Design a protein around this ligand. Structure first.
Ligand SMILES: CCCCCCCCCCCCCCCCCC(=O)OC[C@H](COP(=O)([O-])OCC[N+](C)(C)C)OC(=O)CCCCCCCCCCCCCCCCC
Ligand SMILES: CCCCCCCCCCCCCCCCCC(=O)OC[C@H](COP(=O)([O-])OCC[N+](C)(C)C)OC(=O)CCCCCCCCCCCCCCCCC
Ligand SMILES: *[C@@H]1O[C@H](CO)[C@@H](O[C@@H]2O[C@H](CO)[C@@H](O)[C@H](O)[C@H]2NC(C)=O)[C@H](O)[C@H]1NC(C)=O
Ligand SMILES: *[C@@H]1O[C@H](CO)[C@@H](O[C@@H]2O[C@H](CO)[C@@H](O)[C@H](O)[C@H]2NC(C)=O)[C@H](O)[C@H]1NC(C)=O
Ligand SMILES: CC(C)CCC[C@@H](C)[C@H]1CC[C@H]2[C@@H]3CC=C4C[C@@H](O)CC[C@]4(C)[C@H]3CC[C@]12C
Ligand SMILES: CC(C)CCC[C@@H](C)[C@H]1CC[C@H]2[C@@H]3CC=C4C[C@@H](O)CC[C@]4(C)[C@H]3CC[C@]12C
Ligand SMILES: CC(C)CCC[C@@H](C)[C@H]1CC[C@H]2[C@@H]3CC=C4C[C@@H](O)CC[C@]4(C)[C@H]3CC[C@]12C
Ligand SMILES: CC(C)CCC[C@@H](C)[C@H]1CC[C@H]2[C@@H]3CC=C4C[C@@H](O)CC[C@]4(C)[C@H]3CC[C@]12C
Ligand SMILES: CC(C)CCC[C@@H](C)[C@H]1CC[C@H]2[C@@H]3CC=C4C[C@@H](O)CC[C@]4(C)[C@H]3CC[C@]12C
Ligand SMILES: CC(C)CCC[C@@H](C)[C@H]1CC[C@H]2[C@@H]3CC=C4C[C@@H](O)CC[C@]4(C)[C@H]3CC[C@]12C
Ligand SMILES: CC(C)CCC[C@@H](C)[C@H]1CC[C@H]2[C@@H]3CC=C4C[C@@H](O)CC[C@]4(C)[C@H]3CC[C@]12C
Ligand SMILES: CC(C)CCC[C@@H](C)[C@H]1CC[C@H]2[C@@H]3CC=C4C[C@@H](O)CC[C@]4(C)[C@H]3CC[C@]12C
Lengths: 516, 516
């Protein structure tokens, strides 16, 4: 009963993925009825919205507002609803990511250089993405995901978690750079788009609001595991640990009258970001000028890059989420989820909306938000479709409920991202082994890679993984960032051909195991 | 070998106190040679100086600068040196306290009403205090301290710890009240005594500097108990946990250029605070006017109140510090330490310097700073005279080393007081039982008052102690604050006559035990 197995018939894996999960569909609605699932919806909502506002803004700056916040909120909503209802692993959160923004900036810059319509060029990439995924799913190409071991999974999962933390701290630093601690400030600064000059108390209050939210969140996680108050009340207050932390620090900010803090800013209504540039439906043949015939064929090469990015990101996320370690019983599908994520992305491009991917930190946070703890060991995970569906609906309705969001500071949400980033580093053995570099070999745990293998060998293995982690980081900030998936693919040969001639067969097994 | 035993000969207890401890004098110098003792000196120095600047300032405001910061630094230094060299329990820290400030304000107000010289009136109280202590020590009156049980000790020790925490938070609130978070501030505010108006970033930076110092201090206490880095390095970094926390946040404040923070402010040189009012030596018969003869006899009644305040404060501190629970082997003296503290206080009054007392939180912090931890259980305490002697010398030289202190913010020291206040609530069983009110009865810790006594009876006992704690608090803020020692004395009858008719003899033993 292994999902990653070649049947030997066209669309064999996809049929097996549907036949496996869809018999649980009744359970995937009823199992939602518990207060922990409501606590997950509220937490994952802010986690899911915040990127759609951030990246949506950056897309508006870069692509001359031809694709903006409105487009990304509509895409994240509709794909989120459809995936929650049809998907084989509903705990996956579908949304925009850094590598996709890098491509849109790149493909726009290319279209402006050659004098092409950016938004029409996306429609053709969209058509190729539908053709490629249907071909890959037909011949069962998701069997190749079997070769992606824990080695590549953990390097990837750790890299995203560290960058997510770095990105959160970069936002705090930007406030201090915008609103420095000066002796004298200029009064009557215009604030109609944003504060024109620096302001007093803005940077230090933002620090307090971030630090406050993180503290409260980490304290309420400890309280859940403690032995204070009746057991029933302890779990409920623990389950709602994040949404209590957010409510407190939003009220703290509210009662402070004079000091300025930056709040959430959603679009006016459900409109295209630049009506002069485009509409809702885009004509493949062209809007203003006749779209060239060569690019209608040459759009396969950008479509191949976009496919590889969405595949590697989404399939590695599905492995990390659906590990044997985490108590997942209902099952996962690599063929059905891949067809939906890339298929919807191709159709989305026809309406000028961005294609998305199953993002790691949001997916992991959602799974960690729904998991139960016993005694420390995991008993069960609340595997349903409702938690995913509701977050997608709220992201859709975020424009209508602007009055509520306008009272929420961004500083408060930075504290929640720090909590997400730190909490994501749980099941990653690479993180566990990085902490053993500092511990004496006296107090190291009693795990196989600690008992069976020598300490200096274990550390060398951890060392080679940190070098891989450093090289991937450099590739991601250096302008050659679109060629990360290919550099991440080279982690698979390293593990299978180069490590075996350094380390012994028994050691590689113990250190990198499938089931642990 | 019980210190609190009547011999039946004049100055019997005092001779037994000297004969017991002075044979260890060689050990009380050599046992100082360890890096933990240096870490204690630096921590207890700031803890000892800060009150002498704070109360010294308040004394200057209240007594028309007839007794100020210079007088209190000189007194704390000279009495600190003499007590460290001669005292039977050198871990006691001698300095000014809240109840002594309440008396000086009261006795000044009385002298101004009746038209008497405040500073001369103190000289007579000083002479009575020498007469009373010599009489009490002769007839061995410190045997009465035997009747002060754990019941009264813990109520007292908890009350001082809570007030110390409340006082620390009151100082932070005062900065926000002085420097509110406004939209617009006035520039070119005069800062020659202090900021004349409010300032931007002053209150929020003070909050960050306090919160930062407390965080770092509590993190470095956890690191000491952890299993990270080599054991040798872990203890050294752990022992210097406070002085590392102070150095970090002082450097953080230093590199911030434009923002204002209030720093430590010591006197110019070793001078009397008001030279026009008084000199170094005070003539008992009078300075300007002939001192009245009735007040030379009536000064016995204020001297009796001052004696009771210094006795109750100092002797309860000596019990809490020299408990059987804490590994104290060299021994304590209630007769010798009482003679020194009150005797020096009487002589100090002749030079116009304040009489002091063995303060609880400073004494407890000093003992906790010098105690070793094994595996969690106490192995030993570094009982010496050097740690006490050095802090007294540094408080004396604090005026000369003004350049160093001028760089230290008060906000940083507020974080250190919060750490002291929280950490002081360790051995107090009342605090332990207050936490069990929130825990369910199955998660209780295994101890006699949990196994032998029923849960509802244990909670009633904790309840009656909280009522005693509430009444004492009200008495201390309400203008009748000088009559706290008498209300604290009434805790002894309560425990011995009223509790036995409510609770059973077995229960009172288990809940309130001498050795546990
Ligand atoms: C074991 C881990 C320890 C780590 C602890 C480190 C602290 C972590 C938290 C970071 C700081 C977050 C503080 C946010 C509070 C809101 C402050 C604010 O902006 O209010 C402005 C408000 C604004 O007041 P206002 O605007 O309402 O005033 C009325 C209106 N006017 C001004 C017009 C008259 O000012 C204050 O009065 C705030 C006072 C500070 C109160 C906060 C206490 C901080 C606690 C210190 C740390 C200790 C933690 C607990 C210790 C016990 C644990 C064992
Ligand atoms: C488990 C318990 C969790 C509790 C954690 C809660 C936080 C507790 C600490 C309280 C806040 C203390 C922060 C002090 C930083 C000093 C900032 C400052 O004033 O610098 C001004 C400086 C400016 O100084 P400057 O030198 O650049 O200014 C001069 C230059 N010109 C002239 C151009 C202006 O501002 C900054 O740029 C620094 C901002 C970053 C500060 C750090 C952010 C802290 C957020 C939380 C950290 C998380 C800790 C660990 C998490 C993991 C735990 C598992
Ligand atoms: C709306 O779309 C038009 C069409 O692209 C944008 O017009 C561009 O203006 C920029 C300068 O701001 C020029 O560099 C481009 O050549 C223009 N594009 C074309 C092809 O006309 C306009 O910038 C967009 N406005 C918004 C809302 O961003
Ligand atoms: C120095 O000492 C003199 C003597 O007490 C103080 O003079 C007092 O001045 C206050 C008003 O400030 C009057 O209420 C008192 O009547 C004065 N005292 C007497 C008896 O003359 C003076 O205030 C002190 N200055 C300082 C440094 O505080
Ligand atoms: C205003 C924004 C920033 C925060 C919104 C968070 C809100 C929706 C959260 C914060 C605390 C939450 C409550 C916490 C605890 C409980 C008890 C549970 O048995 C039913 C739900 C209920 C009553 C929650 C409802 C939702 C709630 C009110
Ligand atoms: C979402 C978009 C991209 C999908 C477009 C391709 C369509 C035509 C594909 C996707 C899923 C496919 C079906 C999945 C399952 C089966 C059952 C099998 O016994 C015969 C083939 C059949 C009927 C497949 C062929 C046609 C099908 C509907
Ligand atoms: C309410 C739940 C079920 C769905 C949540 C998403 C909803 C609120 C979103 C998703 C996409 C959105 C639509 C996207 C585009 C348009 C075209 C425009 O000319 C009118 C508004 C309209 C028709 C939007 C209305 C709101 C909408 C339907
Ligand atoms: C992260 C950047 C700075 C690169 C630094 C190299 C790091 C990641 C790795 C590469 C090889 C590693 C070393 C390999 C082998 C040993 C032997 C033994 O004593 C345990 C630690 C030690 C000494 C390792 C420490 C960490 C190490 C130095
Ligand atoms: C005003 C002066 C006396 C106060 C100074 C402290 C007093 C209490 C001290 C200083 C020296 C002390 C005495 C020195 C020597 C002895 C002899 C000894 O066999 C019994 C104790 C006795 C009698 C001491 C106790 C009382 C004493 C007089
Ligand atoms: C500037 C003010 C506010 C803070 C002063 C604190 C200073 C004196 C403290 C902070 C850290 C301390 C050091 C921490 C660790 C060690 C290692 C030990 O084996 C010898 C002492 C030594 C080298 C300490 C010396 C004193 C020290 C430098
Ligand atoms: C090194 C040890 C022994 C002593 C440490 C503290 C020293 C430096 C302190 C304690 C008390 C202080 C003295 C207190 C009072 C006066 C009177 C004044 O008109 C001149 C300074 C003088 C004389 C001070 C000099 C410094 C002093 C002696
Ligand atoms: C501000 C006031 C309330 C402080 C006075 C102390 C309070 C908290 C004390 C006084 C008497 C105490 C109660 C005495 C007896 C019991 C029965 C036990 O089975 C549960 C706890 C309970 C119900 C106690 C709870 C705490 C209590 C109410």
């Amino acid at each position: 009963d292994d999902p990653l197995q070649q049947t030997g018939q066209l669309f064999g894996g996809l049929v097996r993925d549907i036949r496996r999960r869809y018999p649980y569909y009744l359970s995937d609605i009823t199992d939602a009825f518990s207060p922990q699932v409501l606590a997950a919806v509220i937490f994952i909502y802010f986690a899911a919205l915040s990127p759609a506002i951030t990246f949506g803004g950056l897309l508006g700056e870069k692509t001359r507002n031809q694709m903006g916040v409105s487009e990304l909120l509509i895409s994240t909503a509709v794909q989120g609803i459809l995936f929650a209802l049809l998907g084989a692993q509903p705990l996956l959160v579908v949304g925009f990511s850094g590598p996709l923004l890098v491509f849109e900036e790149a493909f726009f810059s290319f279209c402006e250089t050659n004098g092409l319509e950016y938004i029409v060029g996306r429609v053709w990439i969209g058509f190729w993405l539908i053709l490629l995924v249907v071909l890959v799913v037909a011949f069962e190409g998701s069997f190749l995901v079997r070769f992606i071991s824990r080695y590549t999974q953990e390097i990837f999962s750790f890299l995203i978690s560290l960058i997510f933390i770095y990105e959160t701290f970069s936002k705090l630093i930007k406030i201090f750079q915008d609103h420095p601690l000066q002796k004298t400030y200029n009064y009557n600064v215009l604030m109609v788009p944003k504060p024109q000059g620096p302001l007093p108390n803005t940077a230090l209050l933002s620090l307090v609001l971030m630090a406050g939210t993180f503290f409260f969140a980490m304290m309420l996680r400890k309280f859940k595991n403690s032995s204070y108050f009746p057991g029933k009340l302890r779990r409920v207050i623990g389950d709602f640990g994040v949404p209590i932390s957010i409510l407190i620090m939003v009220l703290v900010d509210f009662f402070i009258q004079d000091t300025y803090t930056q709040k959430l800013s959603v679009p006016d209504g459900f409109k295209v970001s630049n009506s002069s540039a485009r509409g809702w439906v885009i004509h493949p043949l062209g809007l203003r000028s006749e779209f060239p015939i060569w690019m209608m064929f040459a759009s396969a090469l950008p479509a191949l890059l976009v496919f590889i990015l969405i595949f590697l990101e989404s399939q590695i996320t599905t492995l990390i989420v659906s590990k044997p370690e985490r108590k997942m019983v209902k099952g996962s599908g690599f063929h059905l989820d891949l067809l939906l994520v890339v298929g919807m992305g191709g159709v989305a491009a026809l309406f000028g909306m961005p294609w998305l991917s199953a993002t790691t930190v949001r997916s992991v946070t959602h799974a960690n938000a729904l998991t139960v703890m016993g005694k420390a060991q995991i008993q069960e995970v609340k595997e349903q479709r409702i938690s995913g569906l509701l977050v997608a609906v709220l992201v859709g309705l975020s424009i209508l409920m602007e009055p509520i969001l306008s009272r929420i500071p961004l500083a408060v949400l930075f504290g929640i991202f720090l909590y997400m980033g730190v909490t994501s580093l749980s099941g990653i053995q690479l993180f566990d082994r990085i902490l053993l570099l500092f511990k004496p070999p006296k107090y190291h745990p009693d795990v196989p890679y600690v008992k069976r293998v020598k300490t200096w060998r274990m550390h060398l293995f951890t060392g080679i993984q940190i070098i891989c982690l450093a090289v991937l980081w450099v590739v991601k900030s250096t302008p050659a960032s679109l060629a990360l998936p290919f550099v991440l693919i080279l982690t698979v040969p390293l593990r299978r051909v180069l490590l075996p001639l350094i380390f012994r067969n028994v050691e590689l097994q113990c250190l990198d195991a499938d089931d642990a």
